[PDB]
Write a protein that binds this DNA or RNA. Sequence first.
DNA 1: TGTATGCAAATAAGG
DNA 2: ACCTTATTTGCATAC
Lengths: 22, 133
Amino acid sequence: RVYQGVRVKHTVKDLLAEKRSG
Amino acid sequence: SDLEELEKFAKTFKQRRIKLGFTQGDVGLAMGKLYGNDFSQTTISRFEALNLSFKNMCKLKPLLEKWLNDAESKRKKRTSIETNIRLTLEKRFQDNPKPSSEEISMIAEQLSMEKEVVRVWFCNRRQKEKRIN
DNA sequence: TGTATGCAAATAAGG
DNA sequence: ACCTTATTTGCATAC
């Protein structure tokens, strides 16, 4: 169930959603 | 906004790629042929979906922009490790997660691999063991 | 067939 | 050179 590999931190997609939320 | 500029560029880039009938792999190869720096289909996909970090998108955008402007006018290859070899490395890791440099060289010699690949395999595997807790 | 993505190999930078 | 932590990046494969 645990993610095995490396993930990108703070994708532009997530940062855009975080900015547009506040 | 920088983020919004990256959003608009990724969209324009994707639209032009599709309008011309290019696949993501096609355009990654094209960037190697034309500008000497090829990128994978995977990377093109992430770029178009904004699934890369801010710094990473800012780094690739000027490269992708060279192709878009035309359309509108260095790393080593990833080593494939055989399943049976990966299992040999994994079983060693379980009782010796941090082999010495000598042992790393001996493992590489026995498994007919490059020493740097074995070294990095153990580095990454230690990091994985931390990630998965 | 082409795209998305899990896993992870290779690289970046500090010590 | 070769560890560390952090991150970029691509096979391989499931859609």
